[PDB]
Amino acid sequence: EVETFAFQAEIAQLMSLIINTFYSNKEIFLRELISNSSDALDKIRYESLTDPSKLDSGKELHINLIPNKQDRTLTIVDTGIGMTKADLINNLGTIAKSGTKAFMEALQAGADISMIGQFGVGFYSAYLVAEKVTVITKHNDDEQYAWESSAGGSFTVRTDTGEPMGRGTKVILHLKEDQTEYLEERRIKEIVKKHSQFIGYPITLFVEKE
Numbered sequence: 476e477v478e479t480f481a482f483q484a485e486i487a488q489l490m491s492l493i494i495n496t497f498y499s500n501k502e503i504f505l506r507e508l509i510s511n512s513s514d515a516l517d518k519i520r521y522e523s524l525t526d527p528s529k530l531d532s533g534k535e536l537h538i539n540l541i542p543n544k545q546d547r548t549l550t551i552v553d554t555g556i557g558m559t560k561a562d563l564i565n566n567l568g569t570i571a572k573s574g575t576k577a578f579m580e581a582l583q584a585g586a587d588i589s590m591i592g593q594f595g596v597g598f599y600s601a602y603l604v605a606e607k608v609t610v611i612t613k614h615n616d617d618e619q620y621a622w623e624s625s626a627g628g629s630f631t632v633r634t635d636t637g638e639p640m641g642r643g644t645k646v647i648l649h650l651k652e653d654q655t656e657y658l659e660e661r662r663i664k665e666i667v668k669k670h671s672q673f674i675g676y677p678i679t680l681f682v683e684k685e
């Protein structure tokens with residue numbers, strides 16, 4: 476059973492701004508998603524210090540970047556804390572309302588889209604390069620979920636019956652037809668080195684079989 480939800484109006488407005496504004500420096504989406512993975516890895520590491528059983532779902536803390544030219548996807552995988560159903564359906568968008576307002580005010584005042592992570596809403600910069608985003612996620616003591624949106628004001632959430640993850644999050648970017656450069660090894664390597672070089676977890680860039 477797939478449930479469909481409307482974004483809060485302020486979040487729909489942010490997503491439309493990201494999709495519609497002319498802004499050539501699209502590559503900053505990857506730093507934003509890696510930074511989110513790093514924060515989620517920090518969170519499970521910290522919680523594990525007082526409850527070590529939180530790592531029973533996996534001790535390895537790391538990030539994989541996986542391009543797939545057949546599927547036209549770039550996937551950002553982490554073994555961080557993961558997200559609950561309440562996170563996906565209400566709580567993250569609730570928090571994002573204030574950062575959206577501030578971000579949009581700052582843009583009117585002269586800021587640019589690359590500063591989006593200073594407002595806590597960098598995830599939505601995925602829509603600079605993706606026509607659809609699918610988030611697969613598993614938090615301790617909750618089930619595995621798939622969130623999905625092609626923008627347009629709505630998103631879906633379902634329980635995910637696919638390959639079980641131990642714990643963590645996969646952000647699957649279904650790239651726009653004209654954004655396939657972000658599947659190329661040399662392009663991703665360049666962006667990771669430019670914007671993500673001091674992240675405190677291994678980042679493994681997978682390479683394409685074909």
Ligand SMILES: C#CCCCn1c(Sc2c(C)cc(C)cc2C)nc2c(N)ncnc21
Pocket residue numbers: 510511512514515553555556557558563567568571595596598610643644
């Ligand atoms: C880090 C951090 C905390 C914020 C939530 N979050 C995000 S960003 C996000 C937002 C703002 C809204 C929606 C509907 C979906 C997502 C993925 N990425 C991850 C991640 N890799 N692991 C755990 N939580 C994450």
Ligand SMILES: [Mg+2]
Pocket residue numbers: 481482483486567568569
């Ligand atoms: Mg929302």
